[PDB]
Design an enzyme around this catalytic site. Structure first.
Site, PDB file in Angstrom:
ATOM      1  N   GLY A  21      -6.508   5.262   7.429  1.00 56.43           N
ATOM      2  CA  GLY A  21      -5.805   4.703   5.584  1.00 56.43           C
ATOM      3  C   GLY A  21      -6.176   3.502   4.928  1.00 56.43           C
ATOM      4  O   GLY A  21      -7.225   3.055   5.854  1.00 56.43           O
ATOM      5  N   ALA A  22      -6.576   3.800   3.567  1.00 60.49           N
ATOM      6  CA  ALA A  22      -6.999   3.471   2.431  1.00 60.49           C
ATOM      7  C   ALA A  22      -6.241   2.630   1.832  1.00 60.49           C
ATOM      8  O   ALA A  22      -5.361   3.250   1.654  1.00 60.49           O
ATOM      9  CB  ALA A  22      -8.407   4.189   2.731  1.00 60.49           C
ATOM     10  N   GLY A  23      -6.889   1.847   1.352  1.00 63.65           N
ATOM     11  CA  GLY A  23      -6.343   0.999   0.089  1.00 63.65           C
ATOM     12  C   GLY A  23      -7.325   0.549  -0.799  1.00 63.65           C
ATOM     13  O   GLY A  23      -8.499   0.762  -0.104  1.00 63.65           O
ATOM     14  N   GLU A  24      -7.160  -0.716  -1.979  1.00 64.15           N
ATOM     15  CA  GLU A  24      -7.949  -0.583  -2.494  1.00 64.15           C
ATOM     16  C   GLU A  24      -8.683  -2.279  -2.538  1.00 64.15           C
ATOM     17  O   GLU A  24      -9.849  -2.287  -2.579  1.00 64.15           O
ATOM     18  CB  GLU A  24      -6.998  -1.069  -3.966  1.00 64.15           C
ATOM     19  N   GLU A  27      -8.875  -1.587   4.486  1.00 66.36           N
ATOM     20  CA  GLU A  27      -8.826   0.347   5.019  1.00 66.36           C
ATOM     21  C   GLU A  27      -8.418  -0.182   6.303  1.00 66.36           C
ATOM     22  O   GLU A  27      -8.107  -1.513   7.072  1.00 66.36           O
ATOM     23  CB  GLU A  27      -9.741   0.845   4.776  1.00 66.36           C
ATOM     24  N   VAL A  28      -7.449   1.284   7.166  1.00 64.67           N
ATOM     25  CA  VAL A  28      -6.343   0.950   8.552  1.00 64.67           C
ATOM     26  C   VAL A  28      -8.035   1.845   9.096  1.00 64.67           C
ATOM     27  O   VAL A  28      -8.566   2.840   8.545  1.00 64.67           O
ATOM     28  CB  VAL A  28      -5.745   1.354   8.383  1.00 64.67           C
ATOM     29  N   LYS A  41      -6.030  -2.814  10.986  1.00 65.63           N
ATOM     30  CA  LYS A  41      -6.650  -3.187   9.224  1.00 65.63           C
ATOM     31  C   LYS A  41      -6.711  -4.498   8.680  1.00 65.63           C
ATOM     32  O   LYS A  41      -6.640  -5.599   8.745  1.00 65.63           O
ATOM     33  CB  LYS A  41      -5.005  -3.394   8.919  1.00 65.63           C
ATOM     34  N   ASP A 134      12.595  -0.394   3.439  1.00 64.05           N
ATOM     35  CA  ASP A 134      11.314   0.615   2.608  1.00 64.05           C
ATOM     36  C   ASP A 134      11.240   2.009   3.758  1.00 64.05           C
ATOM     37  O   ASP A 134      10.641   2.247   4.716  1.00 64.05           O
ATOM     38  CB  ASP A 134      10.112   0.718   2.587  1.00 64.05           C
ATOM     39  N   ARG A 138       7.405   7.939   6.428  1.00 65.60           N
ATOM     40  CA  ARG A 138       6.320   8.097   6.173  1.00 65.60           C
ATOM     41  C   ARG A 138       5.966   6.254   6.921  1.00 65.60           C
ATOM     42  O   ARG A 138       4.672   6.010   6.875  1.00 65.60           O
ATOM     43  CB  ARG A 138       6.199   7.757   4.095  1.00 65.60           C
ATOM     44  N   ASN A 139       7.108   5.711   7.231  1.00 66.10           N
ATOM     45  CA  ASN A 139       6.966   4.622   7.732  1.00 66.10           C
ATOM     46  C   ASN A 139       7.561   4.473   9.131  1.00 66.10           C
ATOM     47  O   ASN A 139       7.291   3.384   9.832  1.00 66.10           O
ATOM     48  CB  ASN A 139       7.829   3.360   7.167  1.00 66.10           C
ATOM     49  N   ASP A 152       5.279  -0.703   8.897  1.00 61.84           N
ATOM     50  CA  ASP A 152       5.125  -1.729   7.460  1.00 61.84           C
ATOM     51  C   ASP A 152       6.293  -2.486   7.485  1.00 61.84           C
ATOM     52  O   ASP A 152       7.486  -2.276   7.235  1.00 61.84           O
ATOM     53  CB  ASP A 152       5.927  -0.224   6.902  1.00 61.84           C
TER      54      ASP A 152
END
Ligand SMILES: Cc1cccc(Cl)c1NC(=O)c1cnc(Nc2cccc(C(=O)N3CC[C@H](CC(=O)O)C3)c2)s1
Length: 287
Positions: A21-24, A27-28, A41, A134, A138-139, A152
């Site tokens: 997983g990744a974001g700005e 990442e995971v 994470k 949420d 997906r969670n 999440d």
């Protein structure tokens, strides 16, 4: 003092091996912990005060929980950088992608068992005074025993980080009317969301409401339309998801009622052989 429940893990105990997983801002990873697979994470240098509070707050929240259907926290790395949160590793990843990659591969009983596990986790959160806000396939994460666990966690980070949540910022088509219309998020709006998750599970990850826009979904719901029966769906399961979508919050089942019903259906599995009628969208005729 929410964090002093969490174990501080030393960086030499942790090996990151693959990005999952990744974001700005981090990442995971799948990795190994001192040996056991774990998910890892990270939070990258330069993070703000708000980012640190949100990130470590997810671990703080998760460390307050102990339930088979809630992702388990192994520990945190906060005295070294990059900071890390370490959890159990769920080998099958996110439930929405899992179902779409495994279309048709499970029995109806297995699908219902996944819903009972999600409902059990949600009852626990609700009774622990935690509103998820949420809840969506997906969670949910899935392990190699087919156990589904709610994931999440956090405060503002939950809706802010989810791309499905659109400008408030809300994942409209999973969200109950009162949460959209006046920001009332409660365990009862999480029940609405759970109804949507039921439909995602029984359809193998179909997107709720298909290509309707967010406005079209909100208008349909307010006019009394609801999602149609999945293919090959037990009547009792469709009845239950429909009650999750009552406009009047008070008429929805609580998670306690959902867990009870699902447990009874699973324990008498022939009850799942009676299917709700499916409205075919294409007619095929042959002489
Ligand atoms: C670490 C962490 C911090 C805060 C909050 C949470 Cl919930 C977490 N824990 C997690 O994000 C996760 C726990 N388990 C996860 N498992 C996961 C996620 C996404 C994909 C997969 C997955 O199925 N695969 C990636 C490896 C494999 C493909 C390969 O081996 O090449 C399949 C697994 S993510």
């Amino acid at each position: 003092a929410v964090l002093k429940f969490t174990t501080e893990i030393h960086p030499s105990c942790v090996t990151r091996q693959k990005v999952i997983g990744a974001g700005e801002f981090g990442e995971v990873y799948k990795g190994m912990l001192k040996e056991v697979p774990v998910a890892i994470k990270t939070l990258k240098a330069g993070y703000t005060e708000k980012q640190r509070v949100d990130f470590l707050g997810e671990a703080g929240i998760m460390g307050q929980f102990s339930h088979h259907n809630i992702i388990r926290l192994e520990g945190v790395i906060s005295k070294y950088k990059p900071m890390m949160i370490i959890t159990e590793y769920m080998e099958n990843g996110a439930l929405d992608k899992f179902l779409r990659e495994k279309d048709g591969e499970f029995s109806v009983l297995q699908l219902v068992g996944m819903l009972r596990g999600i409902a059990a986790g949600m009852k626990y959160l609700a009774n622990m005074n935690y509103v998820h806000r949420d809840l969506a396939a997906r969670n949910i994460l899935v392990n190699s025993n087919l156990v589904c666990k709610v994931s999440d966690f956090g405060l503002s980070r939950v809706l802010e980080d989810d791309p499905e949540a659109t400008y408030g910022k809300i994942p409209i088509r999973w969200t109950a009317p009162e949460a959209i219309s006046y920001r009332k998020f409660t365990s009862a709006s999480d029940v609405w969301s759970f109804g949507i998750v039921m439909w995602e599970v029984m359809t193998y990850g179909e997107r709720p409401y298909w290509e309707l826009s967010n406005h079209e979904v909100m208008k349909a719901i307010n006019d009394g339309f609801r999602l149609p029966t999945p293919m090959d769906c037990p009547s009792a399961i469709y009845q239950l998801m429909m009650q999750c979508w009552q406009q009047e919050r008070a008429r929805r089942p609580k998670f306690a009622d959902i867990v009870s019903i699902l447990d009874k259906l699973i324990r008498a599995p022939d009850s799942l052989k009676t299917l709700a009628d499916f409205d075919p969208r294409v007619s095929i005729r042959l002489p």
